[PDB]
Structure 1
Amino acid sequence: RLVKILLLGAGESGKSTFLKQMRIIHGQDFDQRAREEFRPTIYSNVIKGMRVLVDAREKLHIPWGDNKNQLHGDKLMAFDTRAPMAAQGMVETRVFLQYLPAIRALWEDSGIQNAYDRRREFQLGESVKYFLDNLDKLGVPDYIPSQQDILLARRPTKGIHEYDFEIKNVPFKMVDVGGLRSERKRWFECFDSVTSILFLVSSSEFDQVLMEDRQTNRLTESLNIFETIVNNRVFSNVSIILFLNKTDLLEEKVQVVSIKDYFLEFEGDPHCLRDVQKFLVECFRGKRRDRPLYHHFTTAINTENIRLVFRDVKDTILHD
């Protein structure tokens, strides 16, 4: 009677974002008040992300673009990340504004920028770039996060978030669990009456390592995860749909990095999006041991793209 869909995938694959799209596309959406609650999360993304940047500039021994920015880097590093509000990923507006000037200078520095280009060597979401490039609008006193801002804001998912919605008189329940290794121990609590599983993967994580242990390749982790889910007989009658998310990022990445340097099996033009997308797809099908497998190239932050992709997902699931 109910269509229960589980969103599975390693950390930072796009689950919480997809869930937000459902609310935007089929639910009540986010009114000004509800968007206003993301501001503390957004100012926290920015401050903490920049702190990681100056720290990487130092330890990676990358030189400043301008020495006078050493003072700004000092200001940021002095920010206590473990204080109560900061510990829960939130920063008041008044505090954010005190750091704005320094943050703006640090982001104009070529050293900090070079550090960003090498984020694969550490841990940093490209969503901090989206906000650093929009400091002007986050700065203004009466700033209210846009829909696009809300979608980009990054909040870890420790816990189980459930969202209920309807489409043409059909009740739907989507479940989002965390994807960090430590969070997965809870995945078993949500498998009762599951109709379909949407397996998300950041298609552009081939050059990165896990945040859990900074030594394991991200794609590799995804594949091993998919492997244990897709071959579990208990899910024999469950629809497994594969989402190769962050297509927009892969489109950028293939032009400066080559998947060839991380996965030998690759043969084709590493500078070509279509070639890398097929390799990724084959890699996940290759893990099956048998039931068909449908896949989709998505961009979770793109509302219009998720609108039509889900259209296919709904009809697929509804015809099983």
Structure 2
Amino acid sequence: ARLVKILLLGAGESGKSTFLKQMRIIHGQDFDQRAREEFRPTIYSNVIKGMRVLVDAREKLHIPWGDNKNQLHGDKLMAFDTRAPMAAQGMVETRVFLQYLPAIRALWEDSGIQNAYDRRREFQLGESVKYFLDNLDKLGVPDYIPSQQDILLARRPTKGIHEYDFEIKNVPFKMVDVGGWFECFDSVTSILFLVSSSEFDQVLMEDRQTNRLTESLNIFETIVNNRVFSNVSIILFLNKTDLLEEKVQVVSIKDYFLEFEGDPHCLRDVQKFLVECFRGKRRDQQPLYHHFTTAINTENIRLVFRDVKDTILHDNLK
């Protein structure tokens, strides 16, 4: 009754897992040393895969090496057994990571690899890679304990369902992340719908016909127009705002969405257009609650959730 049930919905990589971690950070029990420890294998895997993508890129993009001696380290990492039990699970043990760390460190120092990194628009590199590559100092310490920020940036896909249960001032929340469905649809108070707002110029890896924003808009359409959710507060999170702010400076959304009007290099104009894209998916209304978020930024999410909490209670009361 007093229980607020919130679903997190949105395509994969939209920031749902990261939002759940922020709830634990902000309103729950912060990860203790053993909890943080469990992330270490994922972080190491994120780094190994990222550098593997970068060595593969500069090769396939024909960028010349910075120092030609790094070929050896490129080969070293291209020979990493992805197939193996642990690695196939998106996990790399400490001892294994430390075997590669010298190659990784030398490769990130390379101007050719730095060049490859700059042309990342041209291939698929995980959001966390540069953050961890610049943090090779601390990951490489024999008893590295991941920090809060490291855990937020650690990328592991969600295959099933995650839940975190927390209270704010004796108000209990049940928050459920359904990966990117109909079984958790029961007794829902609010839906937070996460969008990677910076992916307007990307297609689905498994379906190059489909624009990633288009894929998000179509998912949203099926939710927002379902009668089952008529009394449910639906709140749009245009996430990855830090990335959208960078991308608008260099890419024009008009090239992708012919309906855009305004200045495509103006973040505010682009955000206005995205909001209108989602609003326009609804068949029978005229407020779509929305926030421009950066799910990895704890201070942002603190403010946003404060606002969302008020929205839900104002609505969920009335």
What SS class does the counterpart of residue 249 from structure 1 fall into?
helix
Q: Identify which range, 100-109 or 307-316, moves more after superposition.
A: 100-109
Aligned-partner Cα distance in 2 for 1:233–1:85: 44
Task: Please report the RMSD computed on the Cα atoms of aligned residues, expressed in angstroms.
Answer: 1.5
Aligned-partner Cα distance in 1 for 2:210–2:61: 20
Assess, with a 3 A threshold, how the Cα gap between structure 1 residues 121 and 189 changes in structure 2: closer, same or farther.
farther
Q: Identify which range, 42-51 or 105-114, moves more after superposition.
A: 105-114
Give the drift of 1:215. 4.0
| Contact 1:120-1:207 at 8 Å conserved across structures | no
Give the drift of 1:19. 0.2
Aligned-partner Cα distance in 2 for 1:87–1:19: 25
Aligned-partner Cα distance in 2 for 1:217–1:72: 36
What SS class does the counterpart of residue 89 from structure 1 fall into?
coil
Assess, with a 3 A threshold, how the Cα gap between structure 1 residues 190 and 27 changes in structure 2: closer, same or farther.
same
Aligned-partner Cα distance in 2 for 1:99–1:221: 37
Q: Which runs of 5+ in 1 are unaligned?
A: 180-186
Work out which of the residue numbers 258, 270, 288 in structure 1 matches 2:282.
288
| Contact 1:15-1:200 at 8 Å conserved across structures | yes
Aligned-partner Cα distance in 2 for 1:60–1:249: 23
Aligned-partner Cα distance in 2 for 1:217–1:56: 22
Measured against aligned partners, the alpha-carbon deviations of 1:47-67 in whole angstroms (never above 9, x if no partner) come to 011111211222233333333
Q: Identify which range, 267-276 or 150-159, moves more after superposition.
A: 267-276
Aligned-partner Cα distance in 2 for 1:157–1:212: 17
Give the drift of 1:201. 0.5
Measured against aligned partners, the alpha-carbon deviations of 1:258-278 in whole angstroms (never above 9, x if no partner) come to 222222222222222111111
Assess, with a 3 A threshold, how the Cα gap between structure 1 residues 280 and 208 changes in structure 2: closer, same or farther.
same
Give the number of equivalent residue pairs: 313
Give the drift of 1:75. 0.7
Give the drift of 1:280. 1.1
Aligned residue for 1:184? none
Aligned residue for 2:265? 271
Aligned-partner Cα distance in 1 for 2:24–2:223: 27
| Contact 1:120-1:209 at 8 Å conserved across structures | no
Aligned-partner Cα distance in 1 for 2:263–2:159: 39
What SS class does the counterpart of residue 19 from structure 2 fall into?
helix
Assess, with a 3 A threshold, how the Cα gap between structure 1 residues 120 and 217 changes in structure 2: closer, same or farther.
farther
Assess, with a 3 A threshold, how the Cα gap between structure 1 residues 121 and 215 changes in structure 2: closer, same or farther.
farther
What SS class does the counterpart of residue 64 from structure 1 fall into?
coil
Give the drift of 1:234. 1.6
Give the drift of 1:104. 1.4
Aligned-partner Cα distance in 1 for 2:19–2:178: 12
Measured against aligned partners, the alpha-carbon deviations of 1:217-254 in whole angstroms (never above 9, x if no partner) come to 11111111111111112211111100011111111111
Assess, with a 3 A threshold, how the Cα gap between structure 1 residues 214 and 49 changes in structure 2: closer, same or farther.
farther
Aligned-partner Cα distance in 2 for 1:84–1:58: 27
What SS class does the counterpart of residue 295 from structure 1 fall into?
strand
Q: Identify which range, 65-74 or 296-305, moves more after superposition.
A: 65-74
Aligned residue for 1:302? 297
Identity value in percent: 100
| Contact 1:106-1:112 at 8 Å conserved across structures | yes
Q: Identify which range, 122-131 or 22-31, moves more after superposition.
A: 122-131
